[PDB]
Amino acid sequence: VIRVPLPEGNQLFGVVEQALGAGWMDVRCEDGKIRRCRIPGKLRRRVWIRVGDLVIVQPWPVQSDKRGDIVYRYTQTQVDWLLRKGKITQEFLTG
Amino acid sequence: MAKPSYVKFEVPKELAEKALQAVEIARDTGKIRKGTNETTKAVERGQAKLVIIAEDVDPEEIVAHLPPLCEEKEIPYIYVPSKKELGAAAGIEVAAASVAIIEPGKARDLVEEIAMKVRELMK
Amino acid sequence: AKADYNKRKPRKFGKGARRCIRCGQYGPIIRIHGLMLCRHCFREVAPKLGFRKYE
Amino acid sequence: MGQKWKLYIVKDGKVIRKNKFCPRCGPGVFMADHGDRWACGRCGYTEWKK
Amino acid sequence: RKEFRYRGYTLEQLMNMSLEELAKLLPARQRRSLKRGLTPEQKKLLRKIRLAKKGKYNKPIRTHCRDMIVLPEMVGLTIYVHNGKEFVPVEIKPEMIGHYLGEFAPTRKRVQHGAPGIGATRSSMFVAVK
RNA sequence: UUAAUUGGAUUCAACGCCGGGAACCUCACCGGGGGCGACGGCAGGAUGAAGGCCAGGCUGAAGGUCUUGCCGGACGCGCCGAG
Ligand SMILES: [Mg+2]
Ligand SMILES: [Zn+2]
């Protein structure tokens, strides 16, 4: 079929609003509470993330409010591919 | 070649010796054609030289084939006591029925004695 | 027959009809005046075949 | 693996074996009893069995 | 102009016609194919169309030979082809004789275009790869 | 875009380049079908293993399987390690 970063384990879907700075990313998920993603060191080299890139992250059971952590990105050949299956509704990106 | 629950006649012992120990010396010189249903065609032709038919096989369905084919051919033969020295007389270790081998060499006086003994004994 | 399912076919033209006499590949094979080698093997065996490079 | 070599019609006192020899090879090797042809089993033969 | 005439000869007027007198009424390619004999597979397939034409073989005809040349035997029935992954029905009608069998079983899905991406032009080539 | 549209090369020094003018093969790619364990040991094996065919179904086509019964004369991926 296809190998896509679905929610495996406890993953989250990160669609960011603004970069306050130094790696903090305010994310706007379907969950509601303002989460603030940060980044590991394996990908800070070869990839390039910005706004509008729906990507996958991972949250942390501490306070479940401001969490998230990048593990892998999405390429433009998947971001809109993930619409027809309805796995994610894009109206969590226009309001 | 029936099972001992078939009283055809008796079984002497010089026959057993000089035709069962008469196979090793007869295998290391010629050609062995073991098994029951392997030689049936060659004796149907009449190719069998020294056929030694057994008494171990059951049930009484494919046990008697040369005795009923006896009165149609010449069959220089003997009767067989058992199976262990019969598989081991030539070849393998399984239950053997009739090691009826063509040209058993260097072992001809045992033929000239026992084949004609069992000739003039019965058929 | 279990000898009818690992046996090839006798081609007689097309890239699959000839292979190098020393390496064994199909593709760029030299057929000038008869010898049948790669373009890669002919280059590291030629000075023993008699050839020389003058220009 | 069972046991199957029999029914080569046979009694006591005389024998007349059921299936004939093979005309292709030497005598001794038998033919089929399929019911429409004597296939000869291995050599190929379709005389529409007699 | 409701009957079908190929070169002045109706269907059942040519249905009984031979195969060497037939080829004078077909273009080059099919006249030559009819002249180097039929391949073995097409023999095996004609020997399954003719049975299905008399009374027997009431069972879907399948095939891989897309090269077979439609003929006045096959007019009326509906045979299959193999377009790479599946067998696709081709209801044979007059005005097909002469054409190739595989000519009616297309093989590439019609293409409909999305939107250019990262590299479709010199303005989005190095401004993406950092 | 597609079932697949196989890959490598990206300034000079990647783009009629991989001697690459591919109908089958070449072929590495998508759909389907069938074969392959030198060698040591295990269930089993001359009451006959491995192993092979005229004819007919299934099949795109095939003793590839099954129907049908003929043959061949010793070994054995149905089991473990290895190769
Ligand atoms: Mg090709
Ligand atoms: Zn070479």
XYZ file of C-alpha atoms (C1' of nucleotides) and ligand atoms in Angstrom:
538
model
C 0.000 0.000 0.000
C 1.842 3.089 1.273
C 4.226 3.850 4.148
C 3.078 7.114 5.725
C 3.752 8.609 9.187
C 0.320 7.710 10.572
C -0.243 8.098 14.329
C 1.775 5.152 15.646
C 1.983 4.734 19.397
C 1.015 8.156 20.715
C 2.145 10.451 17.873
C 0.662 13.888 17.215
C 0.076 15.922 14.060
C 1.950 19.204 13.999
C 0.731 22.123 11.895
C 2.497 25.209 13.122
C 1.404 28.834 13.437
C 4.512 30.835 14.406
C 8.168 30.358 15.381
C 8.706 32.460 18.502
C 12.382 31.581 18.203
C 15.232 29.202 19.001
C 13.242 26.156 17.834
C 9.950 26.667 19.680
C 6.986 26.012 17.353
C 3.464 26.905 18.432
C 1.345 24.125 16.920
C -2.384 24.170 16.165
C -3.715 20.626 16.436
C -7.288 19.347 16.641
C -6.776 18.903 20.412
C -7.084 22.528 21.507
C -4.381 23.348 24.056
C -1.444 25.448 22.886
C 1.403 22.986 22.324
C 5.010 24.095 21.832
C 7.123 21.673 19.811
C 10.902 21.370 19.930
C 13.349 19.428 17.775
C 15.916 16.602 18.202
C 19.370 16.654 16.629
C 19.220 13.961 13.957
C 17.193 16.020 11.433
C 18.422 19.572 12.214
C 20.910 18.868 9.400
C 19.316 17.488 6.230
C 15.707 18.741 6.297
C 13.919 22.108 6.200
C 10.615 22.723 8.020
C 8.356 25.788 7.834
C 4.670 26.748 8.210
C 1.929 24.940 6.337
C 3.924 21.699 6.484
C 1.698 19.230 8.272
C 4.203 16.928 9.932
C 4.330 14.344 12.695
C 5.542 15.002 16.245
C 5.326 13.200 19.591
C 3.800 14.567 22.831
C 4.808 14.068 26.462
C 2.524 12.923 29.314
C 3.603 15.906 31.436
C 0.683 18.382 31.678
C -0.535 17.337 28.178
C -0.817 21.067 27.316
C 2.415 22.436 25.773
C 4.013 19.350 24.247
C 5.165 17.859 20.951
C 8.503 16.814 19.424
C 9.472 16.410 15.756
C 10.558 12.951 14.629
C 9.789 13.100 10.892
C 8.455 15.541 8.306
C 6.047 15.306 5.343
C 6.780 15.870 1.662
C 4.495 17.701 -0.761
C 3.628 14.302 -2.308
C 1.918 13.281 0.967
C 0.548 16.446 2.623
C -2.456 16.628 0.296
C -2.424 12.905 -0.508
C -3.674 12.466 3.072
C -7.018 14.139 2.211
C -8.921 11.508 0.199
C -8.564 8.907 2.945
C -9.905 11.569 5.308
C -7.317 10.558 7.905
C -7.050 14.304 8.588
C -9.560 17.046 7.798
C -7.879 20.144 6.410
C -10.436 22.485 8.008
C -8.224 22.244 11.076
C -5.914 24.433 8.968
C -8.348 27.192 7.859
C -10.161 27.456 11.195
C 6.202 -67.299 -2.004
C 3.551 -67.566 0.717
C 3.575 -67.074 4.517
C 4.399 -70.046 6.842
C 0.631 -70.361 7.306
C 0.692 -72.180 3.971
C 1.821 -75.807 4.237
C 3.414 -76.371 0.847
C 6.280 -78.551 2.121
C 9.236 -78.480 4.523
C 12.482 -76.475 4.392
C 15.922 -78.149 4.607
C 19.018 -76.313 5.870
C 21.824 -77.072 3.415
C 19.562 -75.377 0.863
C 19.209 -72.327 3.108
C 22.975 -72.126 3.652
C 24.289 -72.816 0.142
C 21.706 -70.505 -1.453
C 21.486 -67.663 1.111
C 25.166 -67.360 1.977
C 25.529 -67.968 -1.776
C 24.557 -64.357 -2.575
C 27.330 -62.165 -1.129
C 29.891 -64.121 -3.142
C 27.282 -63.840 -5.915
C 26.683 -60.088 -5.580
C 30.353 -59.070 -5.604
C 30.644 -60.785 -9.010
C 27.471 -60.097 -10.986
C 24.141 -58.266 -10.992
C 21.426 -58.303 -8.318
C 17.725 -57.686 -9.047
C 16.122 -57.532 -5.616
C 12.498 -56.960 -4.674
C 9.376 -58.938 -5.503
C 7.635 -57.065 -8.333
C 10.924 -56.183 -10.081
C 11.770 -59.632 -11.428
C 8.218 -60.868 -12.118
C 8.604 -59.517 -15.658
C 12.081 -61.019 -16.168
C 10.913 -64.454 -15.035
C 7.787 -63.866 -17.147
C 10.294 -63.685 -19.964
C 12.345 -66.391 -18.251
C 15.454 -64.376 -17.415
C 15.754 -65.508 -13.781
C 18.912 -67.496 -12.986
C 18.810 -68.105 -9.210
C 15.413 -67.054 -7.825
C 14.961 -67.521 -4.068
C 11.332 -66.936 -3.113
C 10.542 -65.983 0.462
C 8.043 -66.730 3.206
C 7.482 -63.405 4.962
C 4.862 -61.429 2.997
C 1.289 -60.561 3.984
C -1.587 -60.440 3.345
C -2.134 -63.410 1.055
C -2.760 -61.258 -2.007
C 0.591 -60.731 -3.760
C 2.301 -63.557 -1.902
C 1.952 -66.382 -4.459
C 2.996 -65.401 -7.940
C 5.835 -67.675 -9.049
C 4.322 -70.900 -7.603
C 1.221 -70.227 -9.755
C 3.605 -69.251 -12.578
C 5.741 -72.295 -11.702
C 3.773 -74.773 -13.851
C 4.308 -72.468 -16.870
C 8.089 -71.888 -16.616
C 11.212 -73.761 -15.460
C 12.150 -71.632 -12.381
C 15.431 -72.907 -10.908
C 14.673 -71.884 -7.328
C 14.724 -72.617 -3.591
C 12.568 -71.614 -0.639
C 13.654 -68.812 1.693
C 13.655 -68.940 5.522
C 13.659 -65.258 6.475
C 14.393 -61.663 5.459
C 17.358 -60.183 7.356
C 20.039 -62.215 5.598
C 17.866 -61.723 2.488
C 18.134 -57.955 2.396
C 21.714 -58.261 3.652
C 22.567 -61.058 1.206
C 22.858 -58.205 -1.289
C 22.251 -54.489 -1.013
C 20.216 -52.961 1.763
C 18.562 -53.465 5.148
C 14.855 -53.982 4.476
C 12.665 -57.078 4.351
C 13.532 -58.896 1.125
C 11.516 -61.379 -0.919
C 13.363 -62.757 -3.962
C 16.955 -61.799 -4.802
C 16.701 -63.410 -8.240
C 20.004 -62.386 -9.794
C 21.247 -63.049 -13.330
C 24.756 -64.484 -13.784
C 25.766 -65.153 -10.159
C 29.448 -65.749 -10.797
C 32.084 -67.881 -9.063
C 29.199 -69.651 -7.250
C 28.178 -72.319 -9.756
C 28.665 -75.657 -7.972
C 26.081 -74.669 -5.365
C 23.789 -74.187 -8.359
C 24.738 -77.564 -9.861
C 24.000 -79.217 -6.501
C 21.028 -77.455 -4.912
C 19.132 -76.218 -7.974
C 18.955 -79.805 -9.205
C 18.220 -81.105 -5.702
C 15.153 -78.868 -5.443
C 14.414 -79.767 -9.069
C 14.158 -83.494 -8.362
C 12.515 -82.791 -4.989
C 9.329 -81.039 -6.158
C 8.246 -77.985 -8.144
C 9.284 -32.558 -16.048
C 11.386 -30.609 -13.548
C 13.907 -30.019 -16.352
C 11.362 -27.864 -18.238
C 11.226 -24.939 -15.813
C 14.836 -23.864 -15.238
C 15.906 -24.198 -18.895
C 16.316 -21.189 -21.198
C 15.498 -20.603 -24.876
C 17.900 -20.642 -27.844
C 17.929 -17.042 -29.109
C 19.790 -16.162 -32.281
C 19.674 -12.342 -32.436
C 19.143 -9.395 -30.164
C 21.201 -8.194 -27.231
C 20.570 -11.503 -25.493
C 22.173 -13.628 -28.199
C 25.842 -13.020 -27.331
C 27.822 -12.553 -24.135
C 31.419 -11.748 -23.317
C 33.831 -14.657 -23.506
C 35.559 -13.736 -20.246
C 33.203 -11.652 -18.050
C 29.710 -12.781 -19.039
C 27.631 -9.653 -19.672
C 25.148 -8.650 -22.345
C 25.322 -5.225 -23.907
C 28.319 -3.431 -25.388
C 30.182 -6.253 -27.124
C 32.846 -5.946 -29.826
C 32.225 -7.886 -33.034
C 34.904 -6.478 -35.341
C 36.859 -9.246 -37.117
C 35.464 -11.895 -34.807
C 36.631 -11.530 -31.209
C 33.745 -11.247 -28.762
C 34.574 -9.270 -25.615
C 33.156 -6.406 -23.576
C 34.222 -2.870 -24.135
C 35.749 -3.076 -20.641
C 37.744 -6.296 -20.910
C 39.211 -5.543 -24.324
C 40.814 -2.471 -22.813
C 42.782 -4.307 -20.115
C 43.786 -7.331 -22.196
C 44.706 -5.728 -25.519
C 48.490 -5.228 -25.114
C 48.748 -9.004 -24.696
C 46.551 -9.652 -27.738
C 49.247 -7.961 -29.811
C 47.741 -4.520 -30.208
C 49.630 -1.290 -29.603
C 48.670 2.364 -29.388
C 50.543 4.567 -31.841
C 48.323 7.639 -31.927
C 3.099 -45.373 0.362
C 0.853 -48.429 0.675
C 0.847 -51.549 -1.481
C -0.383 -51.756 -5.084
C 0.810 -54.480 -7.427
C -1.821 -57.156 -7.942
C -4.936 -58.121 -9.897
C -2.747 -59.511 -12.668
C -5.466 -62.076 -13.137
C -4.087 -65.218 -11.581
C -5.306 -68.407 -9.892
C -3.888 -71.771 -8.816
C -3.201 -74.469 -11.396
C -2.782 -72.065 -14.328
C -2.281 -68.374 -15.135
C -3.364 -66.069 -17.936
C -2.100 -62.615 -17.006
C -4.566 -59.826 -17.672
C -2.628 -57.272 -19.717
C -0.369 -58.144 -22.640
C 3.332 -57.394 -23.045
C 4.711 -54.278 -24.727
C 5.257 -54.479 -28.499
C 7.534 -51.438 -28.356
C 10.158 -52.626 -25.874
C 10.858 -56.259 -25.046
C 8.153 -58.520 -23.646
C 7.285 -58.524 -19.980
C 6.224 -54.913 -19.420
C 2.469 -54.510 -19.349
C -0.091 -52.028 -20.730
C -2.938 -49.940 -19.351
C -6.556 -50.743 -18.560
C -7.993 -47.237 -18.762
C -11.047 -48.428 -20.672
C -10.777 -46.782 -24.073
C -7.160 -47.234 -25.191
C -4.150 -49.288 -24.163
C -2.044 -46.236 -23.431
C 1.057 -48.444 -22.844
C 1.761 -46.125 -19.944
C 5.201 -44.893 -20.899
C 6.039 -45.410 -24.575
C 2.920 -43.937 -26.171
C 0.385 -46.185 -27.863
C -3.330 -45.657 -28.577
C -4.576 -48.729 -30.410
C -8.088 -48.175 -28.948
C -7.462 -51.115 -26.661
C -8.453 -54.573 -27.901
C -26.932 1.729 -46.056
C -27.991 -0.638 -43.325
C -26.136 -3.681 -44.643
C -22.374 -3.943 -44.284
C -20.282 -4.442 -47.424
C -16.527 -4.798 -47.229
C -15.372 -4.758 -50.829
C -18.737 -5.300 -52.413
C -19.331 -8.592 -50.583
C -21.886 -8.982 -47.802
C -21.187 -10.847 -44.575
C -22.642 -14.268 -45.347
C -21.430 -13.780 -48.912
C -17.914 -13.689 -47.494
C -18.595 -15.894 -44.474
C -18.280 -18.981 -46.672
C -15.274 -17.572 -48.531
C -11.873 -19.233 -48.212
C -8.677 -17.947 -46.582
C -6.471 -17.520 -49.643
C -9.249 -15.871 -51.631
C -9.943 -13.733 -48.564
C -6.517 -12.131 -48.322
C -6.915 -10.361 -51.655
C -9.471 -8.209 -49.832
C -7.336 -7.013 -46.910
C -4.542 -4.419 -46.722
C -0.863 -5.337 -46.825
C -0.077 -6.131 -43.223
C -2.879 -8.623 -42.717
C -2.407 -10.237 -46.124
C 1.224 -10.909 -45.243
C 0.435 -12.197 -41.757
C -2.102 -14.579 -43.276
C 0.692 -15.781 -45.575
C 3.454 -16.688 -43.115
C 1.002 -19.008 -41.388
C -0.550 -18.530 -37.969
C 1.488 -18.872 -34.803
C 0.943 -21.886 -32.513
C -0.979 -19.925 -29.896
C -3.368 -18.565 -32.487
C -3.913 -22.131 -33.646
C -4.856 -23.107 -30.093
C -7.228 -20.136 -29.997
C -8.937 -20.788 -33.325
C -9.455 -24.378 -32.181
C -11.421 -22.885 -29.298
C -13.412 -20.319 -31.253
C -14.678 -22.879 -33.747
C -15.958 -25.212 -31.023
C -17.620 -22.256 -29.312
C -19.205 -21.498 -32.675
C -20.856 -24.858 -33.383
C -22.543 -25.849 -30.147
C -19.900 -26.529 -27.565
C -17.659 -24.603 -25.180
C -20.199 -22.354 -23.496
C -17.532 -20.712 -21.371
C -15.752 -17.332 -21.594
C -12.963 -17.275 -24.157
C -9.817 -15.738 -22.705
C -6.427 -15.057 -24.257
C -3.116 -13.283 -24.197
C -2.628 -13.093 -27.972
C -3.435 -9.487 -28.802
C -1.938 -10.047 -32.293
C -4.823 -12.143 -33.615
C -6.479 -10.714 -36.721
C -10.255 -10.499 -36.466
C -11.941 -12.746 -38.995
C -15.443 -13.524 -40.293
C -15.627 -16.403 -37.806
C -15.464 -14.150 -34.766
C -18.204 -11.748 -35.854
C -21.077 -12.039 -33.409
C -19.468 -13.360 -30.254
C -17.652 -11.562 -27.456
C -14.123 -12.570 -26.529
C -11.596 -11.204 -24.057
C -8.072 -9.801 -24.195
C -5.385 -9.128 -21.580
C -4.367 -5.485 -21.214
C -1.609 -6.124 -18.720
C -3.470 -6.840 -15.511
C -6.981 -7.984 -16.377
C -9.172 -9.365 -19.138
C -11.360 -6.762 -20.826
C -14.391 -7.679 -22.972
C -14.552 -6.686 -26.653
C -17.972 -7.308 -28.212
C -16.972 -8.115 -31.784
C -19.010 -6.430 -34.521
C -18.592 -6.170 -38.281
C -16.279 -3.343 -39.355
C -13.647 -4.890 -37.119
C -12.373 -7.580 -39.505
C -8.903 -6.602 -40.557
C -8.059 -4.769 -37.377
C -5.994 -6.305 -34.619
C -7.553 -7.870 -31.551
C -5.535 -5.899 -29.027
C -6.418 -2.722 -30.908
C -9.589 -2.317 -28.830
C -8.172 -3.018 -25.347
C -6.323 0.154 -24.306
C -3.330 -0.080 -22.086
C -2.514 3.250 -20.373
C -4.899 5.151 -18.137
C -5.826 8.534 -19.603
C -3.803 11.261 -17.932
C -5.129 14.241 -15.961
C -2.777 16.829 -14.619
C -2.183 18.084 -11.104
C 0.046 21.050 -10.383
C 3.748 21.738 -10.926
C 5.978 21.193 -7.944
C 9.463 21.844 -6.599
C 11.671 21.864 -9.670
C 9.186 22.441 -12.467
C 10.978 25.720 -13.184
C 14.237 27.506 -12.348
C 12.457 29.605 -9.735
C 11.873 26.741 -7.281
C 15.013 24.626 -7.643
C 17.722 26.080 -5.368
C 15.279 28.120 -3.252
C 14.154 24.806 -1.741
C 17.270 22.616 -1.349
C 18.896 25.222 0.934
C -0.249 11.438 -14.008
C 0.265 5.617 -13.481
C -0.517 -1.180 -11.465
C 4.688 0.180 -13.201
C 5.954 4.689 -15.702
C 13.457 0.831 -12.621
C 17.900 3.333 -11.545
C 23.047 6.652 -11.466
C 24.849 11.829 -12.802
C 23.064 18.551 -11.106
C 28.211 24.988 -12.314
C 32.961 24.572 -14.910
C 33.893 18.753 -14.577
C 24.887 16.411 -15.103
C 21.640 16.516 -19.574
C 22.764 12.337 -28.543
C 26.112 10.802 -20.941
C 26.172 5.052 -18.511
C 29.046 3.129 -25.824
C 21.515 3.644 -23.164
C 19.298 3.760 -31.812
C 14.965 -0.904 -25.146
C 8.875 -4.828 -29.958
C 10.470 -10.727 -27.134
C 15.615 -11.251 -24.564
C 18.627 -6.610 -22.858
C 15.792 -5.925 -17.434
C 17.148 -4.228 -12.726
C 10.166 -2.356 -13.054
C 4.258 -3.585 -12.265
C 0.032 -8.646 -13.151
C 0.292 -14.040 -13.272
C 2.507 -19.378 -13.409
C 6.215 -22.938 -12.334
C 11.208 -25.013 -10.690
C 16.039 -24.983 -7.069
C 18.894 -27.196 -0.503
C 26.683 -30.431 -2.591
C 26.972 -32.216 2.916
C 25.848 -34.184 8.046
C 21.738 -35.952 10.843
C 15.495 -36.892 11.583
C 10.041 -39.310 10.581
C 10.066 -43.415 6.277
C 12.022 -47.004 2.548
C 13.140 -53.519 -2.309
C 5.547 -55.632 0.811
C 8.714 -51.114 -2.991
C 10.801 -44.268 -1.670
C 13.105 -40.437 -5.124
C 11.766 -39.939 -9.518
C 8.804 -40.085 -15.491
C 3.888 -40.543 -19.824
C -0.744 -41.745 -24.359
C -6.044 -39.275 -23.297
C -9.259 -35.480 -20.380
C -10.472 -31.181 -16.994
C -8.486 -26.361 -14.295
C -5.564 -22.805 -16.959
C -3.684 -17.205 -21.089
C -0.899 -22.383 -22.391
C 0.876 -26.342 -20.121
C 1.289 -34.456 -17.098
C 2.373 -27.748 -13.742
C -1.638 -30.152 -10.760
C -6.254 -33.616 -10.492
C -9.016 -37.795 -13.293
C -6.909 -42.313 -15.250
C -3.134 -46.398 -14.343
C 1.380 -47.484 -16.641
C 6.844 -47.291 -15.700
C 11.032 -46.979 -13.206
C 14.745 -49.474 -9.393
C 17.186 -47.018 -4.219
C 17.201 -43.456 -1.507
C 14.756 -39.583 1.689
C 13.234 -30.376 2.618
C 7.461 -34.043 5.140
C 11.794 -32.154 9.864
C 17.162 -29.378 11.746
C 21.718 -27.202 10.722
C 24.370 -25.709 6.512
C 25.151 -24.184 1.282
Mg 11.311 -5.904 -21.841
Zn 34.220 -8.946 -20.620
